[PDB]
């Protein structure tokens, strides 16, 4: 039962951080976008 313990300790599912940058675009296909907007922020306090 040593390989089983080694595997169980080695799997160790992890975590990753939350997004800070979100983008949106609206366009007719094959042409420059009609609208584009940005929503930045890392403090998670601003309304954006």
- State the residues that interact with other proteins by CB under 8 A: 10-29, 31-32, 34-39, 43, 45-48
Q: Is 19 in the site for a copy of itself (CB under 8 A)?
A: no
CB of 3 to other proteins, least distance (A): 16
- Report the sign of the C-alpha dihedral through residues 9, 11, 13, 16, in that order: positive
Q: How distant, in Å, are the alpha carbons of 19, 31, 42 from that of 16?
A: 9, 36, 15
The closest of 43, 26, 42 to 34, measured between CA atoms, is 26
CB of 4 to other proteins, least distance (A): 16
Binding site for a copy of itself (CB under 8 A): 29-31, 38-41, 48
């Amino acid at each position: 039962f040593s390989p089983l313990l080694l595997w169980s300790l080695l799997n160790q599912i992890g975590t990753i951080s939350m997004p800070e940058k979100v983008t949106l675009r609206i366009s007719i296909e094959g042409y420059p976008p009609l609208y584009e907007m940005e929503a930045q922020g890392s403090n998670h306090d601003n309304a954006e």
